[PDB]
């Protein structure tokens, strides 16, 4: 039990950074994202041009 | 929603300088027209000449 539970303890600091790591990189996804509603805003406007919606 | 209302100030602002210009050409083109009414009361004598009316 006291050796089993050390490899156990380890065995979850491991689990932690996985988890770590992918909920760093959703964070920049979701800025990018929200850059992304803005441009959609900002091209409707009626003084724009075919050109300027490029 | 707060990004999203500042791009949508942007989207107004715009909207106002549009109206802004439109409004100024319809200013000169009443003077213009105020003047023609005038040639034409004027052109309504009964001293003038052919010539005169051309």
Same mark, same amino acid.
């Given at each position: 039990?006291?050796?089993?539970?050390?490899?156990?303890? $380890?065995?979850?600091?491991?689990? /932690?950074?996985?988890?770590?790591? %992918?909920?760093?990189?959703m964070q920049e996804?979701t800025?990018?994202?929200? $850059?992304?509603?803005?441009?959609? /805003?900002?091209?409707?406007?009626? %003084?724009?041009?075919?050109?300027?919606?490029?």
């Open positions: 039990q006291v050796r089993g539970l050390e490899v156990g303890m $380890r065995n979850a600091n491991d689990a /932690i950074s996985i988890a770590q790591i %992918a909920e760093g990189a996804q800025n990018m994202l929200q $850059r992304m509603r803005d441009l959609t /805003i900002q091209s409707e406007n009626g %003084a724009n041009s075919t050109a300027d919606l490029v």
